[PDB]
Design a protein around this nucleic acid. Structure first.
Lengths: 71, 69, 69, 72
DNA sequence: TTATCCGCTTAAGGGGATATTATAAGTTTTATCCTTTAGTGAGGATAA
DNA sequence: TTATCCTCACTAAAGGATAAAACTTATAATATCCCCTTAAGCGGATAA
């Protein structure tokens, strides 16, 4: 499937936006599906540096994926 | 490592590892030049922590975060 | 009943009790399972007697011992 | 908050004193030194009082600065 | 579809450093072990 | 009735020390705290 190492929010957001794109999902439907505003999703994607982890583990849900750490 | 689904557990994993390596909050708060009271609030109240500090902390422990299903 | 401060004063004391109550050392002994002789030493020579026995014959004269300041 | 019931066993009496000893902040060693006996003896008293001798009992009762009486 | 935008309530991060704790030591306070002698205390029992 | 002896298995207590456990400091380490400046995210929602 697809795993690479992410080391930064500007690197990590890239991949997530790619996932949503690929499954052809629109921001408007992830937001009205997890309970956050469309804006939230857009600000996240273009402004990853300062977003709350609740949002980040909340979007993974939307994208139907999870995460693990590794050395 | 197992799978992480919420900020809280995400902080336990990184905590659990910080202890295993016998590292202290102070010796790792200077390796990334960050506030000692930040690594603290992080482990206890990670829910609203910035993703920048998160990654500065992650690389502090010499590991790397990864997406999956 | 005044305060006692020696194994002797403590013995004369309890004996005077056994005496006034028509009891004998040979009978007091039966009821609490101790050698009649043992009671004879308790009164005549209490210094090396044993607290157990001490509270065996005590509870035998159906009495108790409370501390005092 | 300050009063004593009636002691019926050799343990009850033993622990009753171990309590007065501590409530006064006295170590088994200074009491022992006072009355010329070993601390090793004060020790076995609060622990294994069944076989202890009255001599010792009144020796500690005294140093602890107490006395006793008989009850009905 | 999505990057943008005023108002408005709630909070992390960089500063600077301290209440607050969980650990190492550091010793007190107790409990135990050795050897010997001596006296219970239980069996059984008998003077006076 | 009660004080005493005789044999025996058992241990207090005292002399001489010391393991093992309870409380006290050291002292590093994790959580808190005040103040500023700053961005988040929800609301209703609109330009591109």
């Amino acid at each position: 499937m697809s795993f690479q190492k992410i080391y930064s929010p500007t690197q990590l957001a890239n991949a997530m936006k790619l996932v949503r794109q690929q499954n052809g999902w629109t921001q408007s439907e992830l937001a009205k599906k997890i309970g956050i505003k469309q804006a939230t999703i857009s600000n996240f994607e273009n402004n990853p540096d300062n977003t709350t982890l609740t949002t980040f583990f909340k979007i993974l849900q939307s994208l139907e994926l999870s995460m693990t750490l590794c050395d």
